């Protein structure tokens, strides 16, 4: 395939009901945004926009949205498991890394800066793996006295700065992972990463099914940019898919239940076709479908 | 010890923030219930009462309070693990049963009827274990059989104990279980005289509150509800975390209990129910401020 694949991830019960809440919150704003169509007022746009934002955060981790109860330290032994237990995306990642760590490889991961970076690091501390950041920050200053075949490099999707922090790697990235949808693989800094020695490193994007993640990714290759049609299809989908949020299809489940061993072949020959189906398409929902969806809320 | 022990259980992140929400919901009602003390209006009482109820449900499982996303089928292979992953109480139970299932034993479990029963059954399907209910309902070679009884009236004449052996242990899932009642006293004495009681309790949760103040104010006293509500609200921050001492036992998947499982006469290996402070109208205010 295209060297640009998706890796669907589930959603914890908490992640689901969080999203469900986020939607209930913008309930009226949603109906508005779809009623007076095209006219569209700025307040309402910002509402749709931030409802989308908060949905995106929760999709990769609840802590990105709610500090409450976040461990004061992310270093303690138990944290990695706890983080994974609360974000299907993190759980998939961890599963993934449990495989790639066996190999001698440098693997790149791009995600939005800030708390996402920290949580990403914290999650990775549960893996037999070297960790390099490129923002001069970290939660473990100290370096691994250990000997790991696999090193994981954590890059910001929003500007890197390779002159103060260069790639001391001395080897190609065998794979680049998109954690958020904040990642624009077209940008130069990310294009630099992919070509670090075929010409391009495989991209694999972690996406929660039927989540905002799914919406942004699919409509993105069909309406682009900040079109009215993008936001309309994306918001309508997020809201309507809210019920099937983050459940893998029956076909796909065993692969994930099997802790993703299904991917070993492709991991060893990154030239072989991506073993998983292409990003499932999403319907273009109508102002009608959103109303019908939001009703089952109303009593 | 007394043949009546507690088994603390943790709380999932979701169970925590749910409780936290439940509290925020009754925020004003709480301040009211503590301000105009003793006077107490009926609406507010019902508020305190149901805030307590909803907290209790969440403590044993979030699905008891929010249908949203509950699998339409509880039989599929993955359900047991999913349920446990979302209630520290269920996770402890499963851990427990993973031990007791190795033995030739009949183990009794009492919990509130209804969805609790179903979820209990679903959770148990992940265990090498026979399951008997006594409500004629259900959603579906083992040494271990687990008997699920309602805490709220049983009916042993339409559904008798075909067991033919003593219950080596009786487990309280909810706080809905009154071991003093006759039907439960019948169960404990089914062949020493009484089966050991072990009660699953989420630390610093309403569960903890009800159980401890219960042996200190009883019944539906003003002082019970006052100490219980104040505690639930204030402990909200330390909700469902085991003390450093206790953690390894649980991390070790509870093997620490094997000795007691084999000789139910040995003293309960875990500390007695940790006491809770009697909090003041003052402490609840300070707690709710933040």
């Amino acid at each position: 395939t295209s060297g640009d694949y998706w890796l669907p991830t589930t959603m914890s019960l908490y992640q689901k009901e969080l999203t469900d809440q986020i939607v209930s919150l913008h309930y009226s704003d949603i109906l508005r945004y779809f009623e007076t169509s095209h006219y569209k007022e700025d307040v309402i746009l910002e509402s749709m926009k931030t409802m989308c934002l908060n949905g995106s955060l929760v999709a990769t981790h609840p802590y990105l949205l709610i500090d409450h109860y976040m461990p004061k330290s992310l270093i303690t032994r138990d944290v990695p498991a706890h983080l994974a237990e609360n974000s299907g995306k993190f759980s998939v990642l961890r599963d993934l890394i449990n495989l790639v760590q066996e190999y001698e490889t440098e693997t790149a991961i791009v995600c939005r800066p800030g708390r996402t970076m920290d949580l990403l690091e914290a999650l990775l501390l549960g893996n037999k793996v070297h960790i390099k950041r490129y923002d001069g920050h970290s939660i473990k200053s100290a370096a691994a006295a250990n000997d790991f075949s696999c090193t994981v490099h954590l890059f910001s999707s929003e500007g890197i700065n390779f002159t103060k922090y260069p790639i001391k790697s001395k080897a190609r990235f065998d794979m680049l992972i998109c954690l958020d949808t904040t990642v624009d693989t077209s940008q130069k800094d990310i294009q630099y990463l992919l070509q670090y020695k075929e010409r391009y490193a495989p991209i694999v994007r972690l996406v929660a099914i039927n989540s905002i993640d799914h919406c942004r990714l699919f409509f993105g290759k069909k309406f682009d940019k900040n079109s009215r049609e993008y936001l309309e299809n994306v918001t309508a989908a997020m809201v309507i898919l809210r019920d099937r949020l983050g459940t893998l299809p029956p076909d796909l489940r065993p692969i994930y239940s099997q802790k993703l061993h299904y991917l070993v072949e492709w991991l060893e020959n990154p030239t072989v076709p991506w073993p998983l189906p292409d990003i499932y398409p999403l319907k273009q929902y109508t102002s009608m479908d959103v109303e019908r969806s939001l009703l089952t809320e109303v009593h």
Side-chain angles (χ1 to χ4, degrees), chain A:
Chain A
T1 308
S2 40
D4 192 329
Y5 324 109
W6 83 322
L7 181 48
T9 83
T10 65
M11 300 261 304
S12 73
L13 170 52
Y14 180 39
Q15 275 170 305
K16 296 181 192 206
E17 195 59 31
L18 260 194
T19 303
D20 182 42
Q21 279 170 191
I22 293 183
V23 181
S24 280
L25 212 77
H26 303 248
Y27 174 88
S28 175
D29 282 352
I30 300 172
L31 295 174
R32 195 86 189 101
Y33 172 82
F34 283 109
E35 191 155 19
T36 58
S37 78
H38 169 265
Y39 172 44
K40 63 159 200 55
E41 20 201 347
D42 282 339
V43 166
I44 295 310
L45 292 175
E46 282 307 312
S47 184
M48 275 342 214
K49 229 166 160 198
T50 75
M51 156 192 272
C52 279
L53 173 69
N54 296 336
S56 287
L57 294 167
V58 175
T60 105
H61 208 109
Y63 286 141
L64 292 181
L65 191 65
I66 299 194
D67 291 5
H68 289 215
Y69 299 104
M70 201 186 335
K72 285 192 185 178
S73 175
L74 302 176
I75 313 150
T76 73
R77 173 190 53 176
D78 59 300
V79 162
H82 175 244
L83 292 176
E85 199 178 304
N86 271 109
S87 161
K89 186 182 290 190
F90 274 43
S91 182
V92 166
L93 189 46
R94 154 203 212 63
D95 277 353
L96 214 220
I97 302 305
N98 276 164
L99 295 177
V100 19
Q101 69 179 200
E102 296 296 294
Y103 305 98
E104 311 209 57
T105 168
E106 321 289 306
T107 86
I109 295 184
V110 197
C111 67
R112 81 212 312 160
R115 180 184 277 152
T116 300
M117 274 292 326
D118 294 341
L119 291 171
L120 215 202
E121 201 175 19
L123 186 256
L124 287 174
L125 288 177
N127 286 281
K128 321 260 202 178
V129 133
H130 293 289
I131 307 175
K132 262 299 298 278
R133 289 174 69 158
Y134 297 71
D135 48 22
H137 295 99
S138 175
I139 60 183
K140 274 212 181 195
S141 58
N146 216 183
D147 166 33
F148 296 129
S149 45
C150 174
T151 302
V152 176
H153 308 70
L154 325 182
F155 306 101
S156 168
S157 61
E158 304 175 351
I160 299 193
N161 184 351
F162 296 92
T163 59
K164 183 182 280 74
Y165 308 102
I167 318 300
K168 163 271 191 82
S169 176
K170 291 188 178 187
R172 65 144 81 138
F173 299 116
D174 289 296
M175 165 191 330
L176 183 148
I177 300 187
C178 294
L179 190 70
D180 301 84
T181 56
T182 189
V183 169
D184 185 346
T185 48
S186 90
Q187 283 187 192
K188 269 221 60 204
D189 53 331
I190 284 74
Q191 282 290 327
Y192 168 46
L193 286 162
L194 296 153
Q195 295 165 311
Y196 196 71
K197 203 171 180 63
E198 277 171 16
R199 301 183 187 175
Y200 296 86
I203 307 172
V204 13
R205 331 176 88 103
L206 297 172
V207 185
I209 33 281
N210 318 317
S211 85
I212 172 54
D213 276 0
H214 201 158
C215 304
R216 282 193 181 169
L217 210 282
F218 164 85
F219 292 119
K221 57 173 61 179
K222 201 173 171 188
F223 296 99
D224 258 59
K225 217 209 330 174
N226 342 259
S227 41
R228 180 102 60 266
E229 269 211 296
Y230 185 81
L231 190 62
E232 279 178 357
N233 280 297
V234 162
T235 66
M238 174 188 319
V239 174
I240 288 165
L241 293 177
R242 159 182 44 115
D243 65 320
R244 333 149 208 274
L245 217 182
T247 57
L248 305 167
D251 291 343
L252 226 42
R253 279 168 201 144
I255 291 180
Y256 288 75
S257 156
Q258 227 49 228
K259 200 261 165 45
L260 286 197
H261 291 297
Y262 193 82
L263 294 189
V264 172
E265 184 190 5
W266 180 90
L267 279 184
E268 302 178 332
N269 321 272
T271 45
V272 192
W274 186 247
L276 309 187
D278 294 331
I279 177 169
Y280 302 137
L282 308 171
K283 327 212 172 206
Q284 311 207 177
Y285 291 101
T286 303
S287 204
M288 278 292 305
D289 299 314
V290 168
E291 269 196 351
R292 190 181 303 107
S293 194
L294 282 190
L295 268 210
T296 66
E297 221 76 298
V298 160
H299 282 273

